[PDB]
Enzyme design. Sequence first.
Site, PDB file in Angstrom:
ATOM      1  N   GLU A 102     -11.926  11.350  -0.191  1.00  0.00           N
ATOM      2  CA  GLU A 102     -11.987  10.835   1.245  1.00  0.00           C
ATOM      3  C   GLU A 102     -12.380  12.198   1.394  1.00  0.00           C
ATOM      4  OE1 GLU A 102      -9.205   8.222   1.118  1.00  0.00           O
ATOM      5  OE2 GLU A 102      -8.680   8.442   3.665  1.00  0.00           O
ATOM      6  N   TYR A 152     -11.543  15.639   6.344  1.00  0.00           N
ATOM      7  CA  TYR A 152     -12.893  15.322   7.659  1.00  0.00           C
ATOM      8  C   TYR A 152     -12.936  16.532   8.240  1.00  0.00           C
ATOM      9  CZ  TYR A 152     -11.866   9.976   6.481  1.00  0.00           C
ATOM     10  OH  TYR A 152     -11.181   9.307   5.817  1.00  0.00           O
ATOM     11  N   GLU A 182      -1.912   9.791   0.962  1.00  0.00           N
ATOM     12  CA  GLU A 182      -1.527  10.528   2.374  1.00  0.00           C
ATOM     13  C   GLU A 182      -0.177  10.082   2.726  1.00  0.00           C
ATOM     14  OE1 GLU A 182      -3.807   9.757   5.482  1.00  0.00           O
ATOM     15  OE2 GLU A 182      -5.681  10.836   4.633  1.00  0.00           O
ATOM     16  N   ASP A 222      -3.982   2.834   8.182  1.00  0.00           N
ATOM     17  CA  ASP A 222      -5.121   2.461   8.622  1.00  0.00           C
ATOM     18  C   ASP A 222      -5.868   1.571   8.232  1.00  0.00           C
ATOM     19  OD1 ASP A 222      -6.954   3.356  10.568  1.00  0.00           O
ATOM     20  OD2 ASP A 222      -8.442   4.530   9.172  1.00  0.00           O
TER      21      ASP A 222
END
Lengths: 611, 611, 305
Positions: free
Chosen positions: B519, B483, B430, B186
């Site tokens: 995160e 998230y 990740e 990202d």
Amino acid sequence: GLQGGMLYPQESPSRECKELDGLWSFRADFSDNRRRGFEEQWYRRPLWESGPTVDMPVPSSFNDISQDWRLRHFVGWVWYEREVILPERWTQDLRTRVVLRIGSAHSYAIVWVNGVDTLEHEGGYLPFEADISNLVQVGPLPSRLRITIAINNTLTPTTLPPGTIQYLTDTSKYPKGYFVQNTYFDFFNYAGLQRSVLLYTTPTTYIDDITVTTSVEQDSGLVNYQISVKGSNLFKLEVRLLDAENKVVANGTGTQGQLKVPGVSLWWPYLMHERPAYLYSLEVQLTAQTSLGPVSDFYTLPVGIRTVAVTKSQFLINGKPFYFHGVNKHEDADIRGKGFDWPLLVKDFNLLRWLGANAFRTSHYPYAEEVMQMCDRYGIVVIDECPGVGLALPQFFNNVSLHHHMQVMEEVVRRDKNHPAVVMWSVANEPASHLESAGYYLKMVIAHTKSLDPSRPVTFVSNSNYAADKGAPYVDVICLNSYYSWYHDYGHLELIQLQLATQFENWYKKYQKPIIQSEYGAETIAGFHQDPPLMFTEEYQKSLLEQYHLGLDQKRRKYVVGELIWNFADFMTEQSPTRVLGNKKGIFTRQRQPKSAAFLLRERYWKIANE
Amino acid sequence: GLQGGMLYPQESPSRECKELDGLWSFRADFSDNRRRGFEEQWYRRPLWESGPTVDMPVPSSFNDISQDWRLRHFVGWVWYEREVILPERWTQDLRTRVVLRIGSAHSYAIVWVNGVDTLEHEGGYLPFEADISNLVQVGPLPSRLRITIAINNTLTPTTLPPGTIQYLTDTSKYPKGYFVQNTYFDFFNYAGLQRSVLLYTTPTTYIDDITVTTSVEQDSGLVNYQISVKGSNLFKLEVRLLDAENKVVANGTGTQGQLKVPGVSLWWPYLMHERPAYLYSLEVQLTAQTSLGPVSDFYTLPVGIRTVAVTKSQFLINGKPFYFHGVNKHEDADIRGKGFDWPLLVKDFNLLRWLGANAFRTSHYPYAEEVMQMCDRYGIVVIDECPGVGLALPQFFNNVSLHHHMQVMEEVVRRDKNHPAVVMWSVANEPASHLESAGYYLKMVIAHTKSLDPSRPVTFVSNSNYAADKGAPYVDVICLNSYYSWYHDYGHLELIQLQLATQFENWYKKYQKPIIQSEYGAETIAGFHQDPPLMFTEEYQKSLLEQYHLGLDQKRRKYVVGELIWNFADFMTEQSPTRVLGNKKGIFTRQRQPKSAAFLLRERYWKIANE
Amino acid sequence: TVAVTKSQFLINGKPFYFHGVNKHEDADIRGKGFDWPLLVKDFNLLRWLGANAFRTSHYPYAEEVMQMCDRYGIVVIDECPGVGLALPQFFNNVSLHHHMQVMEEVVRRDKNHPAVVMWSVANEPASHLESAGYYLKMVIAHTKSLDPSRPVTFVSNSNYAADKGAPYVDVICLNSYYSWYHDYGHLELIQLQLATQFENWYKKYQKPIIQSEYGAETIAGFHQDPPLMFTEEYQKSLLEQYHLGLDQKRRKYVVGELIWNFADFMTEQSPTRVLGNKKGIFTRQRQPKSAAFLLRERYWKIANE
Ligand SMILES: *[C@@H]1O[C@H](CO)[C@@H](O[C@@H]2O[C@H](CO)[C@@H](O[C@@H]3O[C@H](CO[C@H]4O[C@H](CO[C@H]5O[C@H](CO)[C@@H](O)[C@H](O)[C@@H]5O[C@H]5O[C@H](CO)[C@@H](O)[C@H](O)[C@@H]5O)[C@@H](O)[C@H](O[C@H]5O[C@H](CO)[C@@H](O)[C@H](O)[C@@H]5O)[C@@H]4O)[C@@H](O)[C@H](O[C@H]4O[C@H](CO)[C@@H](O)[C@H](O)[C@@H]4O[C@H]4O[C@H](CO)[C@@H](O)[C@H](O)[C@@H]4O)[C@@H]3O)[C@H](O)[C@H]2NC(C)=O)[C@H](O)[C@H]1NC(C)=O
Ligand SMILES: *[C@@H]1O[C@H](CO)[C@@H](O[C@@H]2O[C@H](CO)[C@@H](O[C@@H]3O[C@H](CO[C@H]4O[C@H](CO[C@H]5O[C@H](CO)[C@@H](O)[C@H](O)[C@@H]5O[C@H]5O[C@H](CO)[C@@H](O)[C@H](O)[C@@H]5O)[C@@H](O)[C@H](O[C@H]5O[C@H](CO)[C@@H](O)[C@H](O)[C@@H]5O)[C@@H]4O)[C@@H](O)[C@H](O[C@H]4O[C@H](CO)[C@@H](O)[C@H](O)[C@@H]4O[C@H]4O[C@H](CO)[C@@H](O)[C@H](O)[C@@H]4O)[C@@H]3O)[C@H](O)[C@H]2NC(C)=O)[C@H](O)[C@H]1NC(C)=O
């Protein structure tokens, strides 16, 4: 020319170190008086020892890099400090000349280097150099230079930009020691070390100060040179000129002479020649018999040969007509304030070429050094201004002030008299030139710049009513500011065209000279659109701009010789109801992203450039 | 440790020049193949001669400083060049060692200095040094060093970050030579020289590489040192340790030893001690009898004494509990891309203290050098990551890739093994750690970092389902990404609290270890507000954040030992429908202005810091 | 008269060309709500752009139809709902029959309006299915057994040769989003991927086409050179390439174009959707964006030839 000399530190056989970038110990001094900064003599012992220090980057205004509002809006003395490691050869060769240089300070700087006060400078957006070699070799050992610099407040009646302080003794409102800084210019008065801080060296007999003046005489041009040395007695000066790379195309010999370079190859602006800003390099080589033998020094100065005249109707560069279609910029950007930055310099120069602006104005104050950028292939003509900004109140036109403006105009001209890009000077921006005293002051400052430098015209930009403007009989080219629809006749773009053509007719009919639309625009914020144009809206801006361009086109090929849309970008201004987080009047955002009006301007600039 | 040594160039008796900043000639090479960059051998003759060059600042990604989209989105070889003026003493003293250093290049750099190819480096966000002294004194005269560097494309299956190229032979769509760069991380893969480029010098027998390991033994701490020299035969090493200024508080003697500094004075993080990040300085002085006599060298290394352990429930610094409440940052900002910048570094460090974040994660790649900033009074703990980003496809876990990740982990550890701020390593972010091959690869890379450096734990952050994560049995502390409400259950903040507590229970119940919420966050754009929270809105962000904090508070004083909100700021990402001009997931804008959520986070961080 | 050739849409015998937009019934606070203020404002921006056509995106509206007939002359494409026909589940006889019922109600509501030049049975349904190609078969059929006065069609976003419903329509409606949805940010690709898409469809169906949807999502204050994502400029670059392309097929056999939305409108929540769809050329609050201006120069230009 003032007692001294200035040339930009560019290494060769005699280099330059540079703390021109880096972190620095810092401290603001306040609570009441000038304060202890001097009553404790902080300069005679490492800032840390004095009290709670902080870090500061250079080049960068200290205003925005912190989270504290009182540092942002501080007025007073501010300190810096750095501990350099002097090379051994630095301090043990006696032929080397080690000069400390600052690219700019504020209204007042005090440098404490060489075991004491070594330098001081008053205001300006200009540089100052100290020392000759003396690096306190007398009783030291481990060469560690400790530099300290103190800087001053926003403004005063005798500095430039002009200001005014004013206390307000608790009148039911305002705390005990409350005072304010009243200013009359459209920008935030950032402070701190915002430019170069670099120690450098030369031999003891150095090429102190050159100077070139150029022209054209059919069979090519001819560089005319002046040199200045400092010391020895015995020496020799022989200069040579090499073209695009190093084809030696000329050679002279003396500390004064000529150089008629045949074949020709002038310095054209982005505007006309397919091969524009052509730079030849001058190699000044000097050999002097000093104390410890005949040492040598070299400098090499980029020389761009071009001529700049003017008539009663048209401006002429390289003897041919030249229409200014550029912009007015500024030194400003998030975080760094007015600090120097290489990437933001490059982006900005790609956008100028992107737009098609072949010229810009040193908006109310001399710029960093990038005037060499204007010289490079870029070919971006420059109107160099000195800080004659808020010359509105009648008090600011007193005799000391006038003497001062004559000093600053010697420095500004010292520093940039070498750039082939600079084609005009500006001694002021929107002064109260209608006032009687100001017209005198103007003729003064102006006639003074005509002396010192007789190579290119002088002027001052005005928002003064023709017939009411006293200084105007003395400018070589007219510079006008007008914001029809803005500032007055709010929202009336139907009037712009009318009110414009007249201002020009009235101006030229009286004063028989070339006019330049040095400023026009509307405060626009991105994301605001309204079909019928309306207020701080992108379309409105496209509308006023579009309408202004309409009026310029009628007289453009007559006596109007220039065009400078207001701002290249949005910048920070002092906080006022009319200013929304700064002057939002630019065609590009503060982060250099384009606005709808930009594209439009880009089209016109390129269309014209193609005519 | 890999065959070499690395210490940061910091002058003293043996200095450093620096073109680490400045303008540079530049050129991108493309139209089809690797192209003529090599088939014409541009390196053997001034770029200008080769073809149409351009200017480039350093440090700065070339991506954004131009107006051309194909340079922005280029993949291939890119060139630089600069012509330095070598001091005379540089090239005529044989005791001096002149090393060229780069702070970082891209996936591949080729430096052509010393009359030839002098250096090459593969990927990483790390530095590389060349030459020993040899400055082509053999047949030269006027010391003018010409440097050339060539750099590579976005990514490949064997580099880190991992990528994949792919041609698309005109299938009705896509032109003839159309190829694309597929990546799985990202962020935008910026290129160019983005960090330090500085030439420096030492004597020929130099303190090649030190290394300190510290601890605590009641009566104060005790620095344990390792040194490495390069050359001579005969020499002497005596080290001494001075406190806050220069109170000599310890001395050792050898090229290996101890140093038990009494009185104590540990390196505390912004979190606990009123006098936090305490730095003692180590002075390494070496005198060696070389060829031309006994020359000396000094280095001085900031040593911060502190211990970092861990249990099955709590993280411990200086032997006491420590809860991470920091952020994840990045190297990004308008114009400069990822180029280094001092003012943006200072602002960012004032905001961290402003917020109350006492820690941050080197988000998917090693940072500039500012890891010394973390050391300074600042006391900002650091989790150092290496580019193990898009390790998603199963192909990226092949054996060469694994060997590579072991190389990069030696460099990352070389460079930062000295910082008392770094308290943990991260070998990946990740990865497809659920996959079987990846779990092996992970144990490998991880067990390898445990060797080389046994001072602080290792880990890799994951978005992997517990029970499905293969690498997790090997991390010393759990790092989780989640998230909830974002990415899934769009707009359901009523679920966050529920889904969270469980992820933690399931994670600890299986793996008996400290979890860190590495995160969490919602993509928010400024100016968007909706009473009922809704989408990319400031309130929503305050809502998810608020809700996440709610779940962290239940296990915070148990086995959850950290918290890292996603981004400190907004940054640029590759263009996708889910990415609106980048990753708008930060609490601060790209220009470091706060968002409504920031204030909230600031309140929690400070509340906790006060508990 | 509302005829239709193998290469053109005929209105009173003189060949026509749709140059309008796709709208929605979405407003602030009131949402789907109805009112004349916004109603009138909308028709004002509509005559403003030079949009002489508009599709009733995904459902039959309210009394704007009275308005299109009314002293305006804005040729509408009357569209029944039936849009989320994604799953094959949604393909049973029960619902096939249900859809079947609405086409009666809709023609039974708009039969007389001169405005409604054509019916559209559905939008972007799973036409790549043989069963769907039969569902759509029955309704395209039935609709014309309700109103033989004007054509029938259904908006498709499938590839040519997988569209089972394509053989029945009378004019094809193609929903392409090149650069968007795929090959993110590749303006240079559009002009071609689109030629090919008009080359193909015709080489087999031999009917006239209508670019029923296109554009790019855009957040208003956003600007960036190298165009870039939800940026005003990007829209100007995308829209432009689509226009540079359609121009090749105009006069040939494409008989209309429909920039996706008139304005932004609310959507359900997704990381892909900012605060609803943003692809609109006027903000939800009816104000122009930069391209709103670039489109209208197109419209009056075209309308002048
Ligand atoms: C670096 O930074 C420095 C800080 O900014 C800067 O110094 C400042 O310079 C400005 C420039 O003008 C000064 O501003 C002027 O101030 C004049 C008044 O000056 C006298 O009073 C000052 C304040 O004294 C009070 O406050 C101090 C701070 O707390 C106390 O220490 C004092 O005890 C005193 O107390 C009062 O204040 C507090 C509450 O309000 C509190 O302490 C207590 O309760 C009490 O109320 C003094 O500091 C100053 O001192 C200097 O001069 C005296 C001798 O003259 C010496 O003893 C000192 O050692 C020192 O040298 C003075 O005593 C104003 O008159 C002046 O206003 C006029 O001019 C402006 C233009 O600037 C006009 O706009 C304005 O209308 C006024 O017009 C006047 O002139 C016109 C003609 O033009 C005339 O027609 C008309 O009649 C009118 O009279 C302006 O405000 C400022 O004072 C300096 N600050 C300090 C702290 O000294 C320094 O210059 C910078 N350095 C450089 C190189 O740039
Ligand atoms: C610095 O920058 C350089 C530029 O980016 C960079 O080089 C590039 O490296 C990448 C890294 O992989 C290469 O990408 C791979 O390319 C493979 C194909 O390679 C072969 O073809 C190339 C292209 O050749 C055409 O185009 C050229 C350019 O115009 C022409 O010169 C050629 O004539 C040829 O023409 C065709 O192309 C045009 C139209 O499309 C037009 O010219 C003409 O009409 C015609 O159509 C060649 O350049 C390349 O050349 C090298 O190797 C041959 C010998 O092998 C030598 O002769 C050359 O001298 C040179 O050394 C090759 O011939 C792809 O196979 C590969 O895809 C596969 O791998 C990726 C992962 O990267 C997968 O995602 C993908 O799915 C594919 O998977 C395959 O492997 C899996 C296993 O993993 C397997 O299961 C599966 O079956 C599958 O096969 C990928 O796309 C790229 O080609 C390089 N570019 C160039 C220009 O060379 C360089 O590395 C950088 N340097 C460093 C140090 O980083």
